[PDB]
Amino acid sequence: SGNGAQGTKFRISLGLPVGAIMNCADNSGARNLYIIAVKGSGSRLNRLPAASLGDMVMATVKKGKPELRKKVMPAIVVRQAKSWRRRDGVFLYFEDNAGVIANPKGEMKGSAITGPVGKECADLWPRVASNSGVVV
Amino acid sequence: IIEPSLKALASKYNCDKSVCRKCYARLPPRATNCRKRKCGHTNQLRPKKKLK
Amino acid sequence: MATRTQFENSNEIGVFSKLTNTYCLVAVGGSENFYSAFEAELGDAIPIVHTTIAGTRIIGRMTAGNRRGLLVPTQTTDQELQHLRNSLPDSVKIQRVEERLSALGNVICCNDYVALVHPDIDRETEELISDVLGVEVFRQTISGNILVGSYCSLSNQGGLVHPQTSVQDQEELSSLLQVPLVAGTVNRGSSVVGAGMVVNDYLAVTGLDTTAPELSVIESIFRL
Amino acid sequence: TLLCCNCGTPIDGSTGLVMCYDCIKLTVDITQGIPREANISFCRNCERFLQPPGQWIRAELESRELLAICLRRLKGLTKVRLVDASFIWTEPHSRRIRIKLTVQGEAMTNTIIQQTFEVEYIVIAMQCPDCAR
Amino acid sequence: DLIVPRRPEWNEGMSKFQLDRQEKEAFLEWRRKLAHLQESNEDLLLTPFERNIEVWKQLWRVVERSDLVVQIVDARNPLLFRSVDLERYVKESDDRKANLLLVNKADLLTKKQRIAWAKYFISKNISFTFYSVMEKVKILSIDINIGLVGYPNVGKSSTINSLVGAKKVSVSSTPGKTKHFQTIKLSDSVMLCDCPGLVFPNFAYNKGELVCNGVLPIDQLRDYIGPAGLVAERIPKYYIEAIYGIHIQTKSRDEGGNGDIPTAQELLVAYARARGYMTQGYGSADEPRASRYILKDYVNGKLLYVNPPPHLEDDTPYT
RNA sequence: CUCUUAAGGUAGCCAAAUGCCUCGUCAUCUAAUUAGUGACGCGCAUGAAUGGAUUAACGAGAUUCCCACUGUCCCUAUCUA
RNA sequence: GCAGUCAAGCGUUCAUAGCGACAUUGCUUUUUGAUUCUUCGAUGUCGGCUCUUCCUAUCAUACCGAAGCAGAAUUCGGUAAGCGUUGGAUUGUUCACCCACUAAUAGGGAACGUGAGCUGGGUUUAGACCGUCGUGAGACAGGUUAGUUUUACCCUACUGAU
Ligand SMILES: [Zn+2]
Ligand SMILES: [Zn+2]
Ligand SMILES: [Zn+2]
C-alpha cells in the first residue's frame, strides 16, 4: 500500500471492485480506466478485491490514445459514488467514480485534474494535491 | 575503533568455535562429539570461517 | 539559502509548508529536522505556525498568503482558524473565502506586489484578493497550465517555471511582472515547481533529493 | 531557457524534456534486466532447437521464427514496445547469432527516447532427447 | 549501387560439390557486401532481402541457360522495382544476353498519364514496353530458352498465360509461394524458366515506405500504422467518403497535432464502429483489424494510385 | 521414360462439424485467451450430383466479441402468499 | 516421489559454505504398473462448487543456528502444522500456461473425501454429420452437436429443544 503513500488512511467504504470502469480526470488523453487489481487487498476465497478512495489500483485503459492502452499502469482513484463515512459523521458521495494515471512512486503523468477531488486522497498522495484545483 | 587487545576477547565468544557438519551447531574448538543428541554425538566438526 | 529537507519522506515542501516575509506555516507530521530548516535559519525574526486546516496537512496548496494577508478556503474550521489568527500578528488579514475552488495555492501565485490567478475564478474573489492583499492580478496562464501556483514559485526578486514553458511565454510573464525567471525544474527533474519548494527574499527550501545544479540556478534567480 | 539540472551547462529545448543527453545516456538506463549473452540448444542431425520447455519449432538457421523464439525467451524486452528487430551478420562457423533490439522506454515524465542496444545468442550442441542395407 | 553478384566461370567441368562451393564463396562475399551497409547508412535503415542461400542458388540455375530474360514490373511505381545491377551483370560472358527490361500491368492507368511515364524514358535511353518511336499506343500479346523475373507477385505466375493460358501454375493471394523453380516448354523452339520467388534490397525509401503495396503479406504485420498513415496521406477524403458511404469526422483537431488530411488514427476510429468489429473486452474500434481490410482493398485494385516518376510533384494522378 | 491390372487429386477449399503430431505457425482481439477471426498448407485421412466452392433471406440450430441490462457475482439482506 | 551413506571432483586456493559423480542403503503409497482376495440378485463412475477435519516431507509468519553472511538481499539447516496460503483470461478438464495482487500465493489424505449435497460441461445407450477402414451390415480409446440426474417421515450421528 505504501508505494508512494505519504501518510496512512482510515478505512473507507470499498466502492468499486475489479471490473470497474471509472473515468479518468487527468489530461493524459485517456477517458476510462479498467481496474484489474488493488494494492493491499488481502485474500479470501471468491472475494474479488476492491478499491476505495485514495487507494492505488493497477489499471488498463480502454478508450484513449493507443500509445497508452494494451498495457497496465498504476492509478489513483479520487472520486467514488459509494456513500462513505467521515469521522465528523457525515456521509458524502460523488456523482461519478473517477481516477488518475500514476507511476508506482505516487507521482502523476498529467498536469491537471478535471474535477473535484477527495480530501481522503489528497492528504495522502501529495503530488495529486499540487495538480488538483478543487478538493471536495 | 576496536583496539585489537579487545577484538581478541570478542572473538573468544563469537569466532573461536567449531561447528558440526551435520547439525550446524556451535561447539567449542577443542571438543569432539557434538553435544546435541539429534546428530548422534558425531565427530564430524570443522572450524568456523574467519578469513574470506 | 536552499536548506534542503523532507517533510516526512516527501520532497514536496510547497505542499506542506508556506513561507513569506512575515511568517511561515507548517503541518503536523513531526520530523523535527524539517522544522530545523527554519528554526535553524530564523532567529526570532518571524513565527512558524503548526496547523491542519480542514483536517488537511496540505497547507500550501489549500492556502494562499502574502506579507499583509492570508487567503484560506471555505472548508476550514474556526478552531484551526483561531490559533492561526492568534499565533500570527494582527497585520495579516485572515479571511475564509466562500468561493467554489478550494486549492487556493494551486490557482494563485502571489508575492508581495503582483499575483497571477486561475482563469475561471469568481469575479468576487477577483476583488476580495486585492482588498485583502492589496495586490494586482493578471489571470492568463503559465504555459497553458491553468494551475499557476503549483507550476511557478515566486519571490519579489525572482521567478521560476517548468521546462515546457515556451520562451515566448517566459518573456511574456517577465513583461507582466518586472521580475526575471528561468525554466528551472526542481527535486531532480520535477515539474511541480510551486510545490517542490517555498521561497522568500533570503531563504529557499527544497527537497533532500534536490540537486546542486538546481540550487545553483535557484540562488541565482531568486536572491537577485 | 533552462539548465540541465545534472550536468548543468546545457540549455535544452522546451518540448518537454529532462536532464542533458549525456547524462541520460550515462546515468539513466532503460535496458537493465537482460542477459546480453543468451544460451540456446541445438542438434546437428534433427536440427530442431527449442525454448527450454517446448516442442521443436522446426525453423531453419537464419530464419524469421528465430525472432519469435528469441523474443519468447524470458528477458525484459517483452515489456517495453519493441520495434526494429533485425539480425546482425555473424560468422557461420562461430555458432553465435547477433540481433539488435530497440525498446521505447519512458523517461522521467512523459518523454520518450530512442535506444540502440544489442543481444548475442550463443548456441550449444545437444542430442535432442526425444529423437534418441 | 549493386544488387546482384557475378556468376562467372562455369567451364563445363566436374566436382559437383565444388561448383557449389564456388557459388557459396560468391555468396559469402555478397553477404559481406550486404552487412557493411548497416554501419554505412545510419544504423536503423535496413533492407528487404532473402536471407536464405538456396533461393538465390535456385535463381542461379534459371538465367545462364535462359539466355534471354524479361523483367515484369507493375505500372504503379517502377522506381523502386527497376533492377539496378542487371545491366552490369548479364553483359560479360559474350553469349545470348541483353534482357531489354520492361514495365507491365498497365491497365490500371488513364491514357493521358501513360505518355506521362513513356516520356520518362525518351530522355535517358532506357528500354521498355507497355503490356498488362512514337508509333505506339498499346498492343496486346503479339507485341532457345528465355526467362521471366519479377520483384515478388508482379504477375510472374499470371503472365504464364501469355503463352498458352490455362493456369498451369497456381496464382495466390500471398507472395511467398513460388519457389523450387518451375520450367515450361511449348512450340519446340522456345523454352521458359519460370523463376522462384524474389525480392531485391534497397537503400532509398528504406524505412519510410509505400513499398508495402505489392511486396509483403498484409496479414502478419505488427505495425499496421505506418503504411496506413501513408495511405491516409494520399487519396483525398472526399472520395473515400463517397465510395464507402460513411461520415467519419470533420477534423476538430485543427491545431499543430494533426492538421488537415488526417493521419491514420482518427480515420479508423469511426469505421470499425460502423462495421461493428469490436475488441475482446471493451466496445471500441479495433484499428489493427480494420486497417487490414482497407489495405487489402488498396492492394487488390478497389483503390488506385500511381506515382510521379523523377521528382517533386504535388498531385500528378487525377482520378 | 516407366512401375503397379486403369488413371495418378484438375478447378476449388482448410488445423474446417474432416488435421494424429497439435495448445500447429504468423498476425489480430485481451492486462492475460488450449478459445474466436483472417492467412499459410507435402492435407495421419479435403475435393468436385459418394456433389465442390460461393451464397441475400430464414433458423426455439452450434460458436466468439461488443453496447445496453441486471442480485449471475463481490455479499448478502428483506418482504408477501 | 522423498531421504540418507561413502566422496572422485566442482567450488579463484579451499571435497563437504553449497553442490557432488561411480556405487550403495532405505522410506512413502498423493503416480503408473503388476495381481485378482471382496463386490456382477448393481457399493451411483470425470471435474468443479460447498464444507469440515487431519498429516508434514514448512511457501509464509515466530524464535534460532550456519554461509563464499560487511550492510541490503539471498541460500542450507533446526524446533514448529498454532495461523494463513488468493483474484482472473483460455480449457469440460484433472494437469498445464499466462496476467495481477500478496506476507505467501506449499504439497497432500479422508471409499483417488463430498451426486437421497448441487451441477451435469465431459465420458458411457438410443437421433445425426465428416474423415479413414470395410464389399456390406457396421468399427474408431478420432473430431462435432443434442440428449429425464428419483425417495428420507425410519435408526444412529450432528445441530438445537422439552
Ligand atoms: Zn552435531
Ligand atoms: Zn547535462
Ligand atoms: Zn535430435
From Swiss-Prot, chain A:
Methylated by RKM1 at 2 different sites, but it is unclear which are the 2 methylated residues among Lys-39, Lys-105 and/or Lys-109. GO terms for biological process: cytoplasmic translation. The lineage of its organism: Eukaryota, Fungi, Dikarya, Ascomycota, Saccharomycotina. Component of the ribosome, a large ribonucleoprotein complex responsible for the synthesis of proteins in the cell. The small ribosomal subunit (SSU) binds messenger RNAs (mRNAs) and translates the encoded message by selecting cognate aminoacyl-transfer RNA (tRNA) molecules. The large subunit (LSU) contains the ribosomal catalytic site termed the peptidyl transferase center (PTC), which catalyzes the formation of peptide bonds, thereby polymerizing the amino acids delivered by tRNAs into a polypeptide chain. It is found in: Cytoplasm. The modification N-acetylserine is found at residue 1. Transmembrane segments: none annotated. It holds the Pfam family Ribosomal_L14. There are 2 genes for uL14 in yeast. This is Large ribosomal subunit protein uL14A. Component of the large ribosomal subunit (LSU). Mature yeast ribosomes consist of a small (40S) and a large (60S) subunit. The 40S small subunit contains 1 molecule of ribosomal RNA (18S rRNA) and 33 different proteins (encoded by 57 genes). The large 60S subunit contains 3 rRNA molecules (25S, 5.8S and 5S rRNA) and 46 different proteins (encoded by 81 genes). One of its GO terms (cellular component) is cytosol. InterPro entries: Ribosomal_uL14, Ribosomal_uL14_CS, Ribosomal_uL14_sf. The keyword Acetylation applies. The keyword Ribosomal protein applies.
Curated annotation (Swiss-Prot), chain C:
Its main location: cytoplasm. GO terms for cellular component: cytoplasm; cytosol; nucleolus; nucleus; preribosome, large subunit precursor. The gene is TIF6. Monomer. Associates with the 60S ribosomal subunit. The keyword RNA-binding does not apply. Keywords: Cytoplasm, Initiation factor, Nucleus, Phosphoprotein, Protein biosynthesis, Ribosome biogenesis. It comes from Saccharomyces cerevisiae (strain ATCC 204508 / S288c) (Baker's yeast). Phosphorylation at Ser-174 and Ser-175 promotes nuclear export. Belongs to the eIF-6 family. The keyword Nucleus applies. This is Eukaryotic translation initiation factor 6. One of its GO terms (molecular function) is ribosomal large subunit binding. It is found in: Cytoplasm; Nucleus, Nucleolus.
Swiss-Prot record, chain D:
It is found in: Cytoplasm; Nucleus, Nucleoplasm. Transmembrane segments: none annotated. Signal peptide: none annotated. Acts as an adapter for the XPO1/CRM1-mediated export of the 60S ribosomal subunit. Unlikely to play a significant role in nonsense-mediated mRNA decay (NMD). Present with 11900 molecules/cell in log phase SD medium. Associates with the 60S ribosomal subunit. Belongs to the NMD3 family. This is 60S ribosomal export protein NMD3. It comes from Saccharomyces cerevisiae (strain ATCC 204508 / S288c). The lineage of its organism: Eukaryota, Fungi, Dikarya, Ascomycota, Saccharomycotina. The gene is NMD3.
Swiss-Prot record, chain E:
Residues 56-201 form the CP-type G domain. It comes from the Eukaryota. It is found in: Cytoplasm. GTP binds at residues 104-107, 150-157, 194-197. Present with 19400 molecules/cell in log phase SD medium. Associates with the 60S ribosomal subunit. Interacts with ARB1. Belongs to the TRAFAC class YlqF/YawG GTPase family. LSG1 subfamily. In contrast to other GTP-binding proteins, this family is characterized by a circular permutation of the GTPase motifs described by a G4-G1-G3 pattern. GTPase required for the nuclear export of the 60S ribosomal subunit. Acts by mediating the release of NMD3 from the 60S ribosomal subunit after export into the cytoplasm. This is Large subunit GTPase 1. It comes from Saccharomyces cerevisiae (strain ATCC 204508 / S288c).
